[PDB]
Q: What sequence folds into this?
RNA sequence: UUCAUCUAGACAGCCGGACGGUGGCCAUGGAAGUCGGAAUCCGCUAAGGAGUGUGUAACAACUCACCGGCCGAAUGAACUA
């Protein structure tokens, strides 16, 4: 097989530490490299969301 | 309202004037209420109440130990 | 191994002997145990050199030696040790001291490797790999973060030469 | 069959109610990922779905087995076995159910932000007066306290300018740190700035009552400079009743000119005790946003 | 005039550490930039080490001094290289501090101590050293304490 | 059945027993032989830092506290059970919170220290009011107008039920701040104070009363007689 | 105020005889299990008695006498 | 029934103390006994947890663990029927 299954995140971090009164998560697991890459990714996501919205507005709406 | 608005309201206006006294008297009444429930509940609800009481006593003894 | 018979017994530790290692010049055996201690042994006499190395608050996970080609002549190689407590300790066996105690890992350190370019590579259960500089008072040069789980093991391209030192297959 | 249907309908009520994190708008997706850890979110909902399928399978298998029961004792044993297997499946969901109850309670209180309407975004360092400006221009109940990070989440207010509805977004403060050591609270503001095409108002305190120097504020502005691309930008100097931009140092005036160098920002002075000035700056921000949106629609 | 006393915990050597003093300073009207500069000047000896800073305010002035503390003095005598929050995190304190420097710290902290003996003050400092996790004479600080109790270690001043 | 149930707490400190009283007994009877002057001191409602300051200033002497009955039993209740001659008068002079001061320092020095030693203390119930306190109208501040209100941090909102119920002060919450409609006089100077007034004064932090250690008498080893000191016994 | 149906306490002959048979079967099974199973098989003086010291003195004297009554 | 406490003071109650190094170390925007992770020491004590809970953005404040003052004679716990 060329690819491995995804890592089981529950082994390292539990639901309680993920969110809730006893949550110990304060930073993102994978922070962005820099603000330029962040805004490029968000612009790409906006474009893809608009394309998908048009494609579903063609039929479903 | 947005975010933790009930907590903000408690911070800004407090609670009802007799909240603490009412809560204290209810917690004082809880022992009589538990005894009356044990002697009054019948059937499946009574059996479940007895089973839960046994489990709670076992857990408390384990915590003390 | 010539006669397939026992030769020496080393019974200094108190708990399980988790890891053993031989010096790259072949002079001394270093054993790290479950009792959070490290011991050094002369193999020819089957004897213990001084007292145990102490300071780790958890059991030893891996032992590595300083390479012979980086060790200056007239001195003995140093010993890097990792442990469950998340710290890497460097021991000078000549004076039987601890020189550096690196502590950057937030979790248990899986393994430590003393490379051939004067660096140390540590892998730990905090999903990171820390590259420390021995020449700079044990300051972490780099932090590599690309794994989503515990890094169980790490290996270097020159590990065979680092473990073999100056000896070859002819045993000269 | 009845017990299986009850479990399945509870699971379906759980699964239909919760939003699809991937399907929502990218702003909502990033905000919910910051708040609730999207990986745990999807894993918990998938565990619910798997439990639903397993309960259905157990019900079908044991009804088929009960077709061949030969006595009351055997049929009772088969029914108890089916209910016990369902109960074991449900007991294996203790942690995801608690996580989902907490997430439901938190997500029910999130403010409604339309990422397509007209938006005045407010940003800057802590203790500069963002919440006070939101109080002045809207009727939101955001707290105003003289210590850092009084506000830990996005707050929304509304107003009307030229018969048009505008929303104003107050954000938790941003610190001048790299994104690797940036935390979730600041990531809320970063995502709001990156996603909401709007008019951004960066608030500066020249009196250093905020605990941050003017140089630090200028550095933060130039660091978050790449964020507001293709958006209206404006710099507002708050707390002018304590210190004015006119009687500042020459080096700090050079810093302000460095700020003004970035196109096409404009510098406006204001005080949160000054109704006329806060109304003027609100009107200017609305005018810039309206001009930008209409010029974009005209093409 | 009257003297106002304020106490804070600030990292030694870091400029602009008086940001947390802004709610306190605000009503008095002092300049936070000058307060931070004075704190940085006063904490030049300790670098990368959390210290207790005392500010005295009179008329329109601000003077900064460092109040000695057991953990801060132990960290200073531990002689560790300065660290950065960007680079170094979760740093342990597991070095060695000799008994002579421990006794020096005890002498420094003796003035505001209710112990009647320099031995008692030294045992307090050794308890603090055990808390921070360092070693004394290549031994446990509690082992040094037990040696003092058994009488092997004689504290010089009486 | 039908009994009160005792509350169960999981703490780290266990109760003391008869062994502690035995140790105090033995220490008192050893100090009686070791030292020369035994003073009886009254230290009612003393703060522990103040007591530790007294102990530090009396380096080389001994101050022994504990149960009054235990101390009297150590000194000997009557003449047929006294540890030393004429010690029953000193034993019966104990009253309330009694401290035994064993020393070899001069009587004049001890008297001078205990006449020149005084510390500021919270006003106690059933004591004379050292001042007149009135909370001003408007927002209630933490000091209650003793210092300027601009300097003072406003009173935290969490104490409002305590002020309304326990302190019987009519308070309201406006925008998260404790407020009163009119100024509230709590204590008048030169007037006996009850528990509620003492609690209000302690909550606002007013400390105008003074603590002076009382010296009842002392016993000398060589003379074997008790001499009354009558120090701070007004 | 709607009173429910009360359960009858009139004895049923069939139930009584069946209870007799069930009790006899239970006793037989208990005897069999007690004979079959494998399991390993003097509170002293009560503390509230007043003359415990006298009882203890008497039993000590009896022990001291019986120590030598068999020897000589 | 068996264990414990008790006029060198029983169960309740009220009042006072409840300290010092110390805001112990790491981490946190902030975290000072009380979101967390590991040490959990020493001094002075009558006694006082590197803290049992409420509380704060953090402190503050209250509380109980423990000790003492007033009161003065029995009381508590675990089992069995
Ligand atoms: N004099 C003055 N003080 C202000 C002004 N704006 C805010 N403040 C003060 O700044 C403190 C903190 O402001 P805050 O609303 O929390 O700003 P934020 O943290 O950026 O949202 C408050 O105590 C206000 O009294 C202003 O325009 N003038
Ligand atoms: Mg704010």
A:
């Amino acid at each position: 097989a060329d690819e491995s299954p995804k890592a089981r995140i529950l082994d390292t971090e539990s639901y309680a530490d993920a969110f809730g009164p006893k949550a110990q998560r304060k930073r993102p697991r994978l922070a962005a490299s820099n603000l330029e890459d962040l805004v490029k990714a968000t612009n790409e996501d906006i474009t893809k969301y608009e394309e998908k919205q048009v494609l579903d507005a063609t039929l479903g709406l | 309202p947005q975010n933790d608005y009930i907590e903000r309201h408690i911070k800004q206006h407090g609670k009802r004037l007799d909240h603490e006294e009412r809560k204290r008297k209810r917690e004082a009444r809880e022992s009589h209420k538990i005894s009356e429930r044990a002697q009054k509940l019948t059937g499946w609800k009574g059996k479940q109440f007895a089973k839960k009481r046994y489990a709670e006593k076992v857990s408390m003894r384990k915590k003390i130990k | 191994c010539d006669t397939q018979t026992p030769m020496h017994t080393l019974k200094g530790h108190y708990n399980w002997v988790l890891c053993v290692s031989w010096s790259p010049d072949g002079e001394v055996i270093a054993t790290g145990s479950m009792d959070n201690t490290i011991r050094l042994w002369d193999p020819k006499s089957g004897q213990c050199l001084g007292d145990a190395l102490r300071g780790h608050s958890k059991w030893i996970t891996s032992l590595s030696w300083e390479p012979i080609h980086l060790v200056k002549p007239g001195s003995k190689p140093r010993l890097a040790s990792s442990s469950k407590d998340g710290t890497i300790k460097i021991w000078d066996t000549v004076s039987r001291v601890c020189q550096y105690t690196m502590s950057g890992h937030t979790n248990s350190v899986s393994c430590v490797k003393w490379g051939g370019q004067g660096l140390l590579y540590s892998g730990s259960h905090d999903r990171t790999v820390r590259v420390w500089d021995i020449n700079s008072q044990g300051r972490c040069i780099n932090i590599l973060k690309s794994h989503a789980h515990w890094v169980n093991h790490l290996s270097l391209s020159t590990d065979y030469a680092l473990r073999i030192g100056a000896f070859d297959h002819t045993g000269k | 069959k009845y017990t299986g249907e009850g479990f399945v309908e509870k699971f379906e009520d759980i699964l239909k109610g919760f939003p699809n994190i991937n399907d929502v708008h990218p702003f909502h997706r990033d905000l919910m990922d910051t708040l609730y850890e999207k990986n745990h979110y999807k894993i918990s909902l998938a565990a619910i779905s798997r439990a639903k399928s397993l309960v259905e399978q157990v019900a079908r298998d044991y009804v088929r087995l009960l077709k061949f029961g030969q006595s009351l004792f055997q049929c009772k044993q088969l029914k108890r076995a089916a209910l016990g297997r369902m109960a074991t499946i449900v007991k294996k969901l203790r942690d995801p159910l608690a996580y989902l109850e907490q997430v439901r309670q938190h997500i029910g209180r999130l403010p409604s932000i339309d990422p397509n309407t007209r938006t005045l975004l407010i940003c800057g360092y802590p203790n500069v007066g963002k919440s006070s400006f939101l109080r002045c221009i809207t009727k939101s109940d955001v707290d105003v306290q003289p210590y850092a990070f009084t506000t830990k989440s996005l707050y929304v207010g509304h107003f009307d300018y030229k018969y048009l509805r505008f929303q104003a977004i107050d954000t938790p403060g941003i610190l001048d740190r790299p994104t690797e050591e940036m935390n979730n609270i600041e990531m809320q503001s970063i995502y709001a700035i990156a996603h909401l095409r709007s008019c951004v108002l960066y608030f500066m305190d020249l009196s250093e009552q905020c605990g941050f120097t003017i140089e630090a504020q200028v550095k933060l502005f130039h660091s978050i400079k790449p964020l507001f691309a293709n958006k209206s930008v404006m710099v507002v100097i708050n707390k002018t009743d304590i210190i004015r931009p006119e009687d500042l140092d020459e080096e700090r005036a050079q810093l302000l000119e460095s700020v003004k160098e970035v196109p096409g920002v404009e510098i406006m002075t204001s005080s949160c005790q000054l109704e006329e000035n806060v109304m003027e700056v609100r009107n200017k921000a609305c005018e810039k946003l309206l001009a930008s949106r209409i010029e974009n629609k005209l093409k | 005039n009257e003297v106002k006393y304020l106490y804070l915990r600030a990292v030694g050597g870091e400029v602009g550490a008086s940001a947390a003093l802004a709610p306190k300073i605000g009503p008095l009207g002092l300049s936070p930039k000058k307060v931070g500069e004075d704190i940085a000047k006063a904490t030049k000896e300790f670098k990368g080490i959390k210290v207790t800073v005392q500010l005295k305010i009179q008329n329109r002035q601000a003077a900064a001094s460092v109040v000695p503390s057991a953990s801060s003095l132990v960290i200073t005598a531990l002689k560790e290289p300065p660290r950065d929050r960007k680079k170094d995190k979760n740093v342990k304190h597991s070095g060695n501090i000799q008994l002579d420097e421990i006794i020096e710290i005890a002498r420094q902290m003796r003035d505001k101590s209710f112990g009647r003996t320099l031995a008692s003050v030294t045992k307090e400092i050794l308890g603090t050293a055990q808390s921070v996790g360092c070693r004394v004479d290549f031994k446990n600080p509690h082992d040094i304490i037990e040696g003092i109790n058994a009488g092997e270690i004689e504290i010089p001043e009486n | 059945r039908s009994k009160r149930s005792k509350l169960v707490t999981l703490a780290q400190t266990d109760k003391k027993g008869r062994e502690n009283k035995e140790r105090i007994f033995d220490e008192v009877r050893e100090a009686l032989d070791t030292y020369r002057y035994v003073w009886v001191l009254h230290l009612d409602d003393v703060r522990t830092p103040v007591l530790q300051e007294i102990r530090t200033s009396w380096a080389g002497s001994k101050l022994i506290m504990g149960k009054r009955k235990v101390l009297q039993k150590a000194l000997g209740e009557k003449r047929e059970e006294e540890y030393k001659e004429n010690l029953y008068q000193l034993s019966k002079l104990c009253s309330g919170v009694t401290g035994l001061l064993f020393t070899d320092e001069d009587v004049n020095t001890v008297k001078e220290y205990f006449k020149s030693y005084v510390r500021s203390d919270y006003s106690r119930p059933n004591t004379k009011a050292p001042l007149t306190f009135t909370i001003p109208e408007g927002i209630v501040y933490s000091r209650g107008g003793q210092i300027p209100a601009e300097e003072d941090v406003p009173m935290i909102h969490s104490l409002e039920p305590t002020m309304r119920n326990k302190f019987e002060i009519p308070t309201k919450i406006k925008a998260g701040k404790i407020t009163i409609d009119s100024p509230y006089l709590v204590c008048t100077e030169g007037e006996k104070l009850d528990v509620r007034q003492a609690l209000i004064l302690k909550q606002f932090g007013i400390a105008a009363s003074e603590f002076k250690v009382k010296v009842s008498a002392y016993y000398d080893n060589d003379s074997s007689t008790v001499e009354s000191t009558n120090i701070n016994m007004e | 105020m709607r009173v429910r149906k009360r359960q009858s306490r009139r004895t049923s002959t069939k139930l009584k005889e069946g209870i007799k048979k069930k009790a006899s079967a239970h006793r037989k099974k208990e005897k069999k299990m007690a004979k079959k199973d494998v399991t390993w098989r003097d509170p002293g003086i009560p503390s509230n008695f007043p003359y415990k010291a006298k009882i203890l003195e008497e039993i000590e004297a009896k022990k001291m006498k019986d120590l030598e009554e068999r020897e000589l």
The first strand of chain F starts at residue 37 and ends at 42.
